[PDB]
Design a binder for this molecule. Structure first.
Ligand SMILES: CC(=O)N[C@H](CCCCN)C(=O)N[C@@H](CN[C@H](C(=O)N[C@H](Cc1ccccc1)C(N)=O)[C@H](C)O)COCc1cccnc1
Ligand SMILES: CC(=O)N[C@H](CCCCN)C(=O)N[C@@H](CN[C@H](C(=O)N[C@H](Cc1ccccc1)C(N)=O)[C@H](C)O)COCc1cccnc1
Length: 426
């Protein structure tokens, strides 16, 4: 019936002076826009149909045409930024917000989905959705005593949309909107459905991706223990944003970082640092590099949790981007650690994999590694053991790699390797 219409026939029907004819053609548009291979969005837009769809959103007397036009606009707003913009320019934002409280659940769900698509386009439209007042009615849809009585797709829909209201930067979302949304996010983070949990963790990762004041308003809600729990989930779609969020938080203050350690996060890291998914192992090592940039008593907890051999592990064999993160973790460790903490690091076998990485062509890692070697030599200086260190480095073939760094030229690299060869190695 309404299958595979041309855009011309859709236009003929929608332009008619007959509500049923308009409904039939709007449904035909919805089906065109719902096909998987190349839905003709630009053709629909060029025909001038967006304003008609938007006016149909307000037809309270005809809920099927509200539903059909809502679904059509949702699929257009899902497209390119230019196409999302056409939807906004047609006036759809307040028309959708008015539909959030519809007695028909399928229409309210459309409005949630479409507003998520619009907010999901970027910072300006996110902020414009907030200004038109979407947050209060969005949160009101979740005001039940037990989230478990809501339909599954329905709850995942609202969670996805809320996380888009948290998502982008330059600027980050308004402080007031964040504070308004956070309590609901905390509740969702405790819901038993893997998609809601994943989406909730993504939202938290967005909110922690900024300056320390932003991280603080999240940590103040008490979510770090729950995030650490999700960090140990079996589902990779949960683990990935939980680790992102956790990694964002330890970019903050030493006190914010200590909350992560206090919650038991370090115990999960033997698994994460050997995880078969490359990006999980990369972000775990990145996370370690920021914990080793903390206080000496925080470095010490890394020691007590047995994590230094795992750092030697990743430095020895990992994807190259992961190894670079491990190199950073080692330079931070040696820059902040005690003499004794540095000696332990050498006892675990850090020198050889460190030296082997001087063969890498990436200039910035070579800098980082040379810095680390310097910090370790300063430890041997206080113990009067520079010579034993030089012998270790020489025998594993490190000296040749440092020698060769001089024919290499970066102003700092060529330099740093000189100093080392003059100061030690006679
Ligand atoms: C971060 C983000 O959301 N990014 C973009 C938004 C585009 C902006 C570009 N300028 C995005 O991927 N959006 C949506 C697009 N929905 C498209 C769509 O057709 N959705 C329809 C709409 C719908 C909704 C409710 C009931 C029935 C139908 C669907 N669920 O069948 C998909 C890909 O077909 C895929 O679904 C994601 C989503 C959005 C809102 C709520 N839940 C899920
Ligand atoms: C040694 C030191 O001073 N570290 C401080 C944090 C100390 C917190 C103590 N608890 C530091 O800046 N550590 C890392 C984190 N870099 C951050 C970073 O990479 N952020 C983004 C995400 C982000 C952005 C803003 C805040 C929080 C998180 C990312 N995932 O790429 C921002 C861009 O600076 C950057 O430096 C390590 C590094 C450099 C290059 C490559 N890998 C790791």
């Amino acid at each position: 019936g309404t299958v595979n219409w041309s855009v011309e026939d859709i236009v003929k029907g929608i332009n008619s002076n007959n509500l049923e004819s308009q409904l039939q053609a709007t449904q035909a548009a919805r089906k065109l826009l719902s096909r998987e291979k190349q839905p003709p969005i630009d053709n629909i837009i060029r025909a001038g149909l967006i304003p008609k769809f938007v006016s149909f959103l307000g037809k309270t007397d005809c809920s099927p045409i509200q539903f059909e036009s809502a679904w059509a606009l949702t699929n257009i707003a899902s497209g390119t930024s230019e196409q999302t913009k056409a939807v906004v320019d047609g006036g759809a934002i307040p028309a959708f917000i008015s539909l959030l409280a519809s007695p028909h659940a399928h229409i309210s769900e459309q409005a949630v989905w479409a507003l998520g698509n619009i907010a999901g386009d970027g910072s300006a439209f996110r902020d414009l959705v907030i200004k038109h007042g979407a947050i209060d009615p969005l949160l009101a849809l979740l005001a039940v005593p037990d989230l478990s009585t809501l339909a599954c797709g329905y709850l995942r829909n609202l969670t996805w949309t809320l996380s888009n209201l948290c998502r982008n930067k330059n600027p980050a979302p308004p402080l007031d909107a964040v504070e308004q949304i956070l309590p609901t996010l905390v509740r969702l983070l405790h819901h038993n459905d893997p998609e809601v949990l994943a989406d909730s963790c993504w939202a938290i990762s967005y909110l922690t991706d900024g300056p320390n004041e932003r991280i603080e308003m999240v940590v103040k809600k008490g979510v770090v223990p729950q995030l650490v729990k999700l960090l140990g989930a079996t589902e990779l779609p949960i683990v990935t944003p939980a680790l992102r969020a956790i990694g964002n938080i330890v970019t903050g203050t030493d006190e914010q970082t200590q909350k992560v350690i206090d919650a038991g996060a370090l115990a999960v890291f033997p698994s994460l640092l050997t995880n078969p998914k490359t990006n999980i192992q990369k972000e775990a090592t990145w996370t370690m590099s920021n914990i080793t940039a903390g206080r000496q008593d925080q470095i010490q907890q890394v020691v007590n949790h047995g994590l230094v051999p795992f750092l030697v592990g990743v430095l020895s064999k990992a994807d190259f981007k992961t190894q670079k993160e491990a190199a950073w973790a080692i330079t931070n460790y040696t820059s902040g650690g005690t003499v004794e903490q540095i000696v332990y690091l050498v006892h675990c076998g850090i020198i050889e994999p460190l030296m082997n990485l001087l063969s890498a062509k990436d200039t910035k890692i070579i800098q980082v590694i040379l810095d680390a070697i310097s910090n370790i030599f300063q430890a041997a200086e206080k113990l009067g053991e520079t010579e034993k260190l030089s012998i270790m480095i020489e025998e594993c073939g490190g000296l040749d790699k440092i020698e060769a760094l001089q024919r290499h030229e970066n102003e700092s690299v060529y330099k740093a390797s000189l100093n080392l060869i003059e100061k030690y190695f006679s």
